[PDB]
């Protein structure tokens, strides 16, 4: 690789991402939170549940469900992750679409 910015906070940059649709519970391992784009994982946790619209939901340090729509929102929820153990509890919310479903 390459030793430049370099930001793996503690314990790894790989955060734990728990996505928890509706009554089911997922996680996604992110070797790469900081490299890697919110788009990037909006779309994974979308086709990993197969869904044309969602809102995931992370739970910050007051337990209130906040939605990542954009970069800067995903990073922050990454470095936070950091501080809870490499792992953030997040929530899908389906948006609202017809196809599929």
Known sequence: ?????????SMEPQVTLNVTFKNEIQSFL???PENTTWADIEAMVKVSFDLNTIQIKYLDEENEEVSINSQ????????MAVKQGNQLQMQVHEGSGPSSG
């Open 1 to 9: 690789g390459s030793s430049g910015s370099s930001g793996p906070h």
């Open 30 to 32: 992110v070797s790469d």
């Open 72 to 79: 800067g929102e995903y990073e922050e929820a990454l470095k």
